[PDB]
RNA sequence: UCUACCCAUGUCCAGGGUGAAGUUCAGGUAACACUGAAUGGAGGCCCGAACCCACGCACGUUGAAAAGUGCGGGGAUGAGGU
RNA sequence: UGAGUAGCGAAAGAGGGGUGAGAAUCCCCUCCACCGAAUGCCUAAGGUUUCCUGAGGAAGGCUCGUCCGCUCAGGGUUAGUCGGGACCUAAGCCGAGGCCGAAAGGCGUAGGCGAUGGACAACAGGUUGAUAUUCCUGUACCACCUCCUCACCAUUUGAGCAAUGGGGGGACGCAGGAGGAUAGGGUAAGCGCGGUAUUGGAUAUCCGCGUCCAAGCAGUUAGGCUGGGAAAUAGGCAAAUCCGUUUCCCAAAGGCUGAGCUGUGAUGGCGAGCGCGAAGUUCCUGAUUCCACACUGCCAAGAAAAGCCUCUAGCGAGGUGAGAGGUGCCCGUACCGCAAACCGACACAGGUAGGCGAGGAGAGAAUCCUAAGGUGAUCGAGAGAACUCUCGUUAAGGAACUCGGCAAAAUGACCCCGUAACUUCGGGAGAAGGGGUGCUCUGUUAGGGUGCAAGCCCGAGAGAGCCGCAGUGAAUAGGCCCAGGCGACUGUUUAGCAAAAACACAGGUCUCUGCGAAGCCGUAAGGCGAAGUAUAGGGGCUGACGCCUGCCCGGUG
């Protein structure tokens, strides 16, 4: 589901987009929408704390069910929808009892299939189980840390994690980037692979399209002035004579770790 | 030549108004010293 | 609020003399009074049935005499249309 | 209240060109490729008024104006102006 | 002092009367001239009496002034329906308790405020010097009330009512092209009124003018959107007939919406024209408007809440429907609003958001002349030197000046014909560059639209002829070609010297970050990052695309 525009104008010279056969509808279910106004990188007091942001196309939030709390009720899925909040695509699945919900559409999901979420659910694409029931060596997504909080850890398009074995109160699971982690065995994850796997291969042709997405221009530190960036200044195009390359606020910004070294979670990260 | 001043009564009152001054702490001192000076037009 | 203080003065003008013939009268009334108690007051104090009342107010005209630049007092004018077959007023 | 950026909500862009993607037909092939018409209507597409910008020249320089006017210029469905 | 010098702020007035002490400048009249997608008509922000009438001319008016946006005395703005309030909410603001903080205070839950948005019932004629959907005229509509009237239900196997609680709706993006209808226009035919002229001719297919009417009420519709019924019910904090989800059955009806069109509204008004008042139809063309974000396509995936419908929980002895009679408050309402009333110190060649915005030719809101309508622009007249500025022509040569073809000149519209090297196959390309363009007849040409016809409108072509030097006879709408640096490109910047090779860019690469991510603002509460989760965010560097990106880790990190 990737197509190329033949270059007619100059802007479309290098361009790719994703045709939406995986999508099944265009109009969402009114009930689950929620308002959302874009902040544009401004803090509560109004100051700007996040460069390179603001000014996209206005979007409306669709509340997704990351918890999968409702257990035992057979869920039917009939849609696959586009959602401009995160790369992945979602599925509005309607339950036997009669209330509907949105779920991250996993790879290999099609309209009409069934869904289960109990702690004894069969293991297929779209089901959700507490990790203790999950068997070793099975791909999984939408993991969380504190049980009942809802999936946080594998949610973007085409992202997946692998379970490397259960050993007790916790479990060993290989997140994306391969940094295996120790996680509580009482947490509920969603089995499968996130179903927009081709999202990486997009080739945004126009600057205007990135601006539509809402990314402001980024100016190099080098072309700044001395007072407003540690790199700015110098006659002509100058190389950075500041040993380590540095950030706009003074710190070095190449090849050095940054996580406060005493934090508790570190003892679980270090499994590796 | 859209010049440096553009009149707008709503905004004039909303920023420099007596309510706006009285709301904050510093506005109270501004009114206090204006009254002490004895100015006729106390606030905008 | 006694009704007698609601109506301050009438107004004598060419247009007032006009409207007198077609049975519409002009009155300077209290600034705070609204379209209702003016009607009730004219009814009570003249004993005359009234059809409709229209109210309009002027700002205070600025004026200058000698060297001083004061402002004339604000005015709230009232127009009352009396019904047919009703008694007139002095 | 100018200006820079941002948020919420409205509003403006005469007219004419080019002709994308798909889709119908016919041929084509076991089937698929493909080939030709028709339809189609996309572009930070083209020419050009309103609008916006300010590249050249002249004048003005105790000026009509404490930054403009006159004649040419650039964008003009967009990262648009307001 | 400069010095009676500079300046007197883009512009067509001319003349005859009037007033008056005094007239280029004020009033009236007749021509002439200018704008006419505005210099016109409404209406914001804003100005705050400048608006109107009668008086005055010291100052203001770059002159004068009998004059007025100046002075003086009076006068002028009428709303249940227009805009805003007692209706709703976005951003943002405030914020009872609270969290934090040397103090002041910062943050923020409940909650409230907040239109630039949503919902919301009056319109077409008249009227004075100033107001008019407000005043008057005729017709209406909306919410609520009952001294009253009739039709009906039960006054607990309860009629009726309905929630600050659910559910449905309100409810939304951009572009494109059909269709339907209507503003609007043509005066084409017909009709009515007036006229037939003196400069050569014209009772003639001759000239001037006009040729309509709502809102509401009742029908109808281009159409658009909709499948419907039955049973059950792990859900929608409580209910469930409502919503949702299942299963069985019928498949067009019925339903919702709908520009507009019909009648009435109109026995009335308006209406060319001398208080009265004729005709008032049809045809042709036809939207930038409405059906309508209706349909199609697209991806960048496109507010909330209350008005409104419905479900019960609940109240319930008096109510429902329709008449009849009543009630309906506050603020704005004058005038300018592309200008001399606003912002620029000025009666300033600047700027000022919206709605309407005609005709001839035309693709057009361009172009030039004109309509309604407005204006003749606040110093003049008379000489017609230099010099300066803005323009028009120049024999011959033609870029020889020049830093540089700076400037100026030249092309320009439409229809036919041909278009190269290179190319990322789109382009290059309107390449280059040739031919035609008027008028008459063959013609109310083939043919097409419109309509039953009559008629009206669109008009590919050719073949004959007629003119002038010149036929897109004016206004206005590419100069072109060859090469080369730099930058892929559209875009952005030093408001007010420098718009570029600088910035950005999509693309690439390195590195950080496992989510109370990192990074960042703040002391901290709080946040943004993000109601996002390594196909995601932050940072450094390079900048489409094609081929590539070698060696050194001794030093600094």
TrEMBL record, chain A:
GO biological process terms held by the UniProt record: cytoplasmic translation
Cross-referenced Gene3D superfamilies: 2.30.30.30, Nucleic acid-binding proteins, Ribosomal protein L2, domain 3
One example GO MF annotation: transferase activity
Entry keyword annotation includes DNA-binding: no
Annotated region (Disordered), positions in chain: 218-272
Keyword tags: Ribonucleoprotein, Ribosomal protein, RNA-binding, rRNA-binding
Residue ranges of domain Large ribosomal subunit protein uL2 C-terminal in the record: 123-252
Residue span(s) of domain Large ribosomal subunit protein uL2 RNA-binding: 41-117
Any one GO cellular component localisation term in the record: large ribosomal subunit
Domain of life: Bacteria
Biased segments, Basic residues type: 257-272
Family note: Belongs to the universal ribosomal protein uL2 family.
HAMAP family: Ribosomal_uL2_B
Summary of the function given for this chain in its UniProt record: One of the primary rRNA binding proteins. Required for association of the 30S and 50S subunits to form the 70S ribosome, for tRNA binding and peptide bond formation. It has been suggested to have peptidyltransferase activity; this is somewhat controversial. Makes several contacts with the 16S rRNA in the 70S ribosome.
Known partners and oligomeric status: Part of the 50S ribosomal subunit. Forms a bridge to the 30S subunit in the 70S ribosome.
Protein name: Large ribosomal subunit protein uL2
Organism of origin: Bacillus subtilis
From TrEMBL, chain B:
Family note: Belongs to the bacterial ribosomal protein bL34 family.
GO molecular function, one term: structural constituent of ribosome
Segments passing through the bilayer: none
Record-level GO BP terms: translation
Organism: Bacillus subtilis
Gene field: rpmH
Chain positions covered by the region annotation Disordered: 1-27
One of the record's GO cellular component terms: ribonucleoprotein complex
Protein name: Large ribosomal subunit protein bL34
Comp. bias intervals (Basic residues): 1-19
Keywords, sorted A to Z: Ribonucleoprotein, Ribosomal protein
UniProt keyword Ribosomal protein present: yes
From TrEMBL, chain C:
Record InterPro entries: Nucleotide-bd_a/b_plait_sf (IPR012677), Ribosomal_uL23-like (IPR013025), Ribosomal_uL23/eL15/eS24_sf (IPR012678), Ribosomal_uL23_CS (IPR001014)
Keyword Ribosomal protein found: yes
Molecular function GO labels: rRNA binding; structural constituent of ribosome
Pfam families: Ribosomal_L23 (PF00276)
GO cellular component: ribonucleoprotein complex; ribosome
Annotated TM spans: none
Gene3D superfamilies cross-referenced by the UniProt entry: 3.30.70.330
Keywords tagged on the record: Ribonucleoprotein, Ribosomal protein, RNA-binding, rRNA-binding
Family: Belongs to the universal ribosomal protein uL23 family.
Entry function: One of the early assembly proteins it binds 23S rRNA. One of the proteins that surrounds the polypeptide exit tunnel on the outside of the ribosome. Forms the main docking site for trigger factor binding to the ribosome.
Subunit structure: Part of the 50S ribosomal subunit. Contacts protein L29, and trigger factor when it is bound to the ribosome.
Name of the molecule in the record: Large ribosomal subunit protein uL23
Lineage: Bacteria, Bacillati, Bacillota, Bacilli, Bacillales
Gene: rplW
């Amino acid at each position: 589901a990737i197509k190329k525009y033949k270059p007619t104008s100059n802007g479309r010279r290098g361009m790719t987009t994703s045709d939406f056969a995986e999508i099944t509808t265009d109009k969402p279910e009114k009930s689950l929408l929620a308002p959302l106004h874009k902040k544009g990188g401004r803090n509560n007091q109004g100051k700007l704390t996040v460069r390179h942001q603001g000014g996209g196309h206005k979007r409306q939030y669709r509340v997704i069910d990351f918890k999968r709390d409702k257990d035992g009720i057979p869920g039917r899925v009939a849609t696959v929808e586009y959602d401009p909040n995160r790369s992945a695509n979602i599925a509005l699945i309607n339950y036997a009892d009669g209330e509907k919900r949105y779920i991250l559409a996993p790879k290999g999901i099609q309209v009409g299939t069934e869904i289960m979420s109990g702690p004894e659910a069969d293991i297929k694409v779209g089901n959700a189980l507490p990790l203790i029931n999950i068997p070793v060596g099975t791909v999984v997504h939408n993991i969380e840390l504190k049980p009942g909080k809802g999936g946080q850890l594998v949610r973007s398009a085409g992202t997946s994690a692998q379970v490397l074995g259960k050993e007790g109160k916790y479990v060993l699971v290989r997140l994306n980037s391969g940094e295996v982690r120790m996680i509580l065995s009482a947490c509920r994850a969603s089995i499968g692979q996130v179903g927009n796997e081709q999202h990486e291969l997009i080739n945004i042709g126009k600057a205007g399209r990135s601006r539509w997405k809402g990314i402001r221009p980024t100016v190099r530190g080098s072309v700044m002035n001395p007072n407003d960036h540690p790199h700015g200044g110098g006659e002509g195009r100058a190389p950075i004579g500041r040993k380590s390359p540095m950030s706009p606020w003074g710190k070095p910004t190449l090849g050095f770790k940054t996580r406060k070294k005493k934090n508790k979670s570190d003892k679980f990260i270090v499994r590796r | 030549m859209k010049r440096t001043f553009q009149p707008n009564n709503r905004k004039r009152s909303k920023v420099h108004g007596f309510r706006s001054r009285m709301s904050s702490k510093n506005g109270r001192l501004v009114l206090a010293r204006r009254r002490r000076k004895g100015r006729k037009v106390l606030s905008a | 609020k006694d009704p007698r203080d609601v109506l301050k003065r009438p107004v004598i003008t060419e247009r007032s003399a006009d409207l007198m013939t077609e049975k519409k009268y002009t009155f300077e009334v209290d600034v705070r009074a609204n379209k209702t108690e003016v009607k009730d007051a004219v009814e009570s104090i003249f004993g005359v049935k009234v059809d409709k009342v229209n109210i309009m107010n002027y700002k205070g005209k600025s004026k200058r005499v000698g060297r001083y630049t004061g402002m004339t007092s604000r005015r709230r004018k009232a127009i009352v249309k009396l019904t047919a077959d009703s008694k007139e007023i002095e």
